[PDB]
Each structure stands twice: as structure tokens, then as C-alpha cells.
Design a protein around this nucleic acid. Sequence first.
DNA 1: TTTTTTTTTTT
Lengths: 589, 197
Amino acid sequence: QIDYRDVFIEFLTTFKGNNNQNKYIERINELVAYRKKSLIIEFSDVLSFNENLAYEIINNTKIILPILEGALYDHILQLDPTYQRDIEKVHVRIVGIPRVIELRKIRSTDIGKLITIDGILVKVTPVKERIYKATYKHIHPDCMQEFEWPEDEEMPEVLEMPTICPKCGKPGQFRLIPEKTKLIDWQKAVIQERPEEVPSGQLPRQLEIILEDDLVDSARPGDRVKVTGILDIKQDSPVKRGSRAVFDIYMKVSSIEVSSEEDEKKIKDLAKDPWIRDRIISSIAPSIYGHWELKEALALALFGGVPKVLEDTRIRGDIHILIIGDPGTAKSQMLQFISRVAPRAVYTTGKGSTAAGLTAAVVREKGTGEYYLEAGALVLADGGIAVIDEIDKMRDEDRVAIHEAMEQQTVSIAKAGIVAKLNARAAVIAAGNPKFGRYISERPVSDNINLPPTILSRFDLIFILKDQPGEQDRELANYILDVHSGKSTKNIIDIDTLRKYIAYARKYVTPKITSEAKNLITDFFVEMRKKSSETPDSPILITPRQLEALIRISEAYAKMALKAEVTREDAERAINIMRLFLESVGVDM
Amino acid sequence: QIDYRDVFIEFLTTFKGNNNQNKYIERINELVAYRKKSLIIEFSDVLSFNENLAYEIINNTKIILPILEGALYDHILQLDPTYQRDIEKVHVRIVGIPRVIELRKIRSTDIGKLITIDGILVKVTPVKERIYKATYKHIHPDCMQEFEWPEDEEMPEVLEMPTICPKCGKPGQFRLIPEKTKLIDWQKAVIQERPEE
DNA sequence: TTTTTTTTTTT
Ligand SMILES: [Mg+2]
Ligand SMILES: [Zn+2]
Ligand SMILES: [Zn+2]
């Protein structure tokens, strides 16, 4: 009854934020400056301003939304006439709806209402074009007339062809005219419920969502997203008569969120502590006793180095870690922790993986007999971390796919007439067991791990974990029993804060190596080479590839402390950890 | 509105090249020598010579492109009558269009406009033939009439058969006549975006 | 092509 365009338009112009900044008028600025055509409004903000407007949006969404959009378009038109003849429609998207429903609990009562669903994006289709207003021509020697068939409304999800010519009243043949047809961008994606919500003994459920207009290509597969929109039943084969009055539901997306100022302030405060590096290492797997050297290396892989593009070649910034340990050394517990704290990580197992599943799988569209690719584990981990457990138990045919990923950071696909090269810039963390149960110290690493030597050289660091009973058993027993009793360590950064810290560092920090750091690295290398030249009788090689590892590790240390330069201390720490690896593989100074 | 046919002809004949050599005339003569039927021009030269002509090419390419080809064809046959009886339609192609769009960034607003794309060829089909003007015969014991169904219009990409015989005004059965059907060479290729982008 | 269990030939 009461028009809400009046209260809405002044709400945009008059609203004060946390720091008294008038965000919405600032947000509306680049909408006309950069021609966004889409606006984002928080539900809490509109609720505090006027609850009557807020509750009308949730309930009567299908009616108030077109009215609100028209008011905003007029506001932009008077503010900048140049928007005309450029963008003819502006979308306003509402986020933060309190009505959040689990994927498994959707029932018929929620159809046609604005709801929010949290899940994981698993599938994305290429962008396509959908007709919303067609133009046909009547093929009848008398007629030769053109008209817009879905008059006075929009073309439904099912393409319907006119049967009677509206301009002559006769049936016959109608020809589509693509020149005068109105199109709109259209994309389809599949969302899956999070593994924490799946009930015992059940399999995860999936829901189909539709992204249109500017919402296309707003997310990548494997991302955790929050999506808001309207549910509706799906019609796909109306001509398929015969039983089956049962339909599936699909979601019509109106707004999507992936995964901000106070957090940035909180991150900066943490970096001010001189011992921030020690705190971060102590926060890696707090439930595991000992393994300080391994924890330090795992922290470095989370941050990584800085990739370098030379005149001809490319230098990867990712760090690869290989862990060999006796059974029961808590190898899998840390890998589970790493996959949970990293902003983007994929956890795989040697036995549960295949070559097609790791890189890309060809799917034949039975409906049209068409071939298209599906992203594999390594591709989904691009820009993140790939964790592989029990690498020694993987099939040899499935292991060769990893060889290209670690070396060239690329995956080559040539099958079913599809040729492409895919980026796989991901850090690889692998764990394995020795050949004969426990580890034999006297024998070299190569004959004690059951892996080809060609893959050993591709790892920046290798660690050996030995479960030798001794005087530390009492401390380990006391620590474990405390964990089972609920006792937790203090001064530990929680997972959520730690994940945000890593994401910020990987995005805004690019350390640069100073001259002093370069001299120390060069001096250590040449003196090591001279020492190694006397007797290079070790299974672990000392090739110049180790020099790149030293560069990467030093950059990671600087990035951990949010430093813009690599100083003497960072280079010294990188040498120490590199020296331990060069001597813990069974070869002495 | 303004007939650019005269402007196009003088532009070709009076184009100041790197040394005012009128290279467009040189390639026109080369085209006549080997019967190439395809003339390529640079958008920068057109814009420098007459920016108004350049805008019309880049904006109304659906309408004015056949007009320019007709003007060029008349000039060629006037220059050399022997070009006739060999090529009935010359081709003019534009290069260096400033409107460059990334492949992933294509949206609905770019449909029906002249754009350029950079990529990698992956698949190429063998050369085939496409019908653009078919000839049909009405199989109705009183008709025995032949006609070209797509009257005053090029045959669309969808092969459609007439429903009413235009010559006799009756429905029925129609048979295609390959011997009186116009054909054009047709090939399909697939372009893939570069891995860098 | 792809994963799977099966009998079969052939990589
Ligand atoms: Mg394990
Ligand atoms: Zn009609
Ligand atoms: Zn007839």
C-alpha cells in the first residue's frame, strides 16, 4: 500500500556507518563511475534504519524489488545523465537474510520465498545466452510480418513458439529473428552441502542454482559460498508425457557471497609482536607434542615464496615438503590440520585417487554427445595447497601426473579431441612410510622409502620422523592424556584468525631480497659446493636447484612477519633450516 | 545516408602510403592478376583518410558492407573487363579493429557488433558446402514447377522447405534440385583462449 | 572416456 521508494531513496543518501562515513553514497559512487549496474545492501543496515522496509523486502520480494530498482535508476540518471544509453537496468542485491535453511531440510513450504543457503560450489557451466523476448516472422506468402511473441510478459523457462499469427490470425510456419531477439547472460552451477552437515551413514546432497546477468563467473569450483534467492521447481522435458508428476527444485540466485576492516586491523596488531613467527609456529597443530622442526617447515609452505618470471623460464614460488615417518608418528593428524587452516587446500589419498581425478576428467554429455572437461584435484588447488597422504601407495600410472605439476606447475590434457594446458600452481605436501616398517638410519633415504629418485629431487625439503622409545615417553604420555582431558594450551592463535592472517599475507606482501641477504646465501652455497666437491658421496644431491629453495624459504620467512624486505636474520634462519635438511638425510658436513 | 561509395573509390586510388605509392592500387592490380576476389584494408588507413567512413564500417557493417563491395566490383570490372565471367562477387575485409574483446569477457551486449578475438586454433573440420539459394520442385500431379524457395532473401542457416507452392498456391510435397542450387564453401573451426589469460 | 566387475582378447 504505502510506497517504500521514498524511505528507501533517503536511506541510501542518509545512513551513517561505524566510522561516520556514509558508505552507501560512497558505494553508489563507483557504481556510476565504473558502470557496475549492481548494488549491494546489508539487511541489518536497512533493518536498523526502518524495519518496515526491511520486512517488506523479505516477504513481498517479487513485487517490491522491481519498484525499488526503478527508483535507484532514476537517482543515478539525475546524478549522471551519461548512465543513459550505457546501462538500461540496475540490480539491487540484498545480503544477510536471517532466513538460513540447511540444504537437507528444504521442504515445500519454502518454495517462492527468499532464503539463504551455505554450501560448496562443485560444478560450473560455461556462460550461455537465454532468450527473454523473442521476435518471430510468419512464413506465409500473405503475411511477411514480424512480432515479439511473448507479448505483455517475459518468455518463460520453456521456449514456446506461437501457433496463431497475431498479425493475421492464421497458423503456419514461424521463423526466429535473432537480430531483434533480446538475450541475457545465463550460467548454471551446482552447490553441495558442507561435510559437517551430512548425517551419519548418508551421502551429501546437491542443489542446482542459476546465475544470470552480472552474477556469472562470480565464483570458482571448490569455494565455500553463501547464496540468496528464490526456490522454484525445475521443468526440463515437458514433452516427455507419461507419469512422473514429480519435479526437482532449483534456486534462482539474487546474491552470492564467497567465504573486513576490524580483521585487517587485528592482523596488523599481531604482526607488531617481535615474536610473531614463534607464535605462529606454536599455533600449528597444538594437539601434537614435539615435532618443532616439522611444524616450522609446514608454516613456511602455508605462506610460500614469490614467483619470478624471467626472460625465458619461470621460477615457482611454491614449496614442496615430503615427510617420511614410522607408523603412528601423527603424520596424518598434521596434514588434516594443514588442510583445515589453509585458505584453499585439497586433501587426497594415494589409494583414493586416479590420474583422471587428479588433473581433469572427460565427461561425455549423453544428451548431445558432446565432450567437456571437469576440473581435477590439482587444478582445484591452483593458488593453494595440495595435500597427498600415503603417496608411496599410489599407482605408478597415477603418480606420473604429479611429476609435471611439481616441476612445470602445469597439466597437459590431450584426450577425446581436447587439447589444453592447465595451470597447477599449488604447493604439494606428501607423507609416506618406510619400506620395512620403522626407519633404518644406516641405509640411505633412497632405498628406505620406495620411491623413484626422479621424484625425490623435486621436493624442497624432506623430513624423517623416527619413533624411537626413550626418556621423552613420559612427557608424550602426559601431554596426550591432558589433551583427552580437555586441557588446552594458551597463547595460541585460533584457526579462524590464523586463516585470515595467511590470506592477507599471501595477497599484500611481496618481500624483496636485499644485497646483504644475497651475499649470505651465495657464500653459504659456494662454501657448501666446495665442501661437497671434496666428497659428494650422498644420496641427496647438491645441485643448484637447492639455491632456489633457499631463496623461496627466505622469502617465506619475511612474508610470515609481514615484512617487505628480506633481511640478514631471515637469510640466517633459512640457512639453518636448509642445513638441517642437508644433514638429516644421513649425510654429515 | 551519404553515399560513401565514391569516397571509398577515391580513398583506394588516392591513399598516401609510406611514400604516397598508393599501395591499394598495387594490390588491386595484383588481385586482378591472380583473381583473388578478396581485398583487405586497414582500419587505421580508413580512419586517417576519413574517420567518418571508418565509424560507419565499425558501426553499421551489416548494411554498408555489401554496398562497398558493389562499388569495388564495378571499379574492378571497369579497370579490367576480363575479371567478369570468373568472379561474380568480390570480398572486402577489415583488419585492425580497435574493438578488441577478451574471450571470457563476452556478454550479451556484444551480439551483432563487429569485434575481434585473439586465440588458438584447436580443431578444423574438412571443407564442406552450404546452400544459400536452393531450387525446389513441387511434386503435385498438376504442378511440375521449379522455383527458388528463399525468395528475395538468402537462405537462412536453418534449412527450411516451402509449405505452399508459390507458383500454384497449393501445399504438398517438394523435391530439391541439386543441379540448380547455389552453393558456397563452408568450414568450421574452434578457437581457444590462450593459457596466459 | 571413465570406474567398475566381469569374461575376454590384447594391449
Ligand atoms: Mg597416517
Ligand atoms: Zn501471419
Ligand atoms: Zn505447385
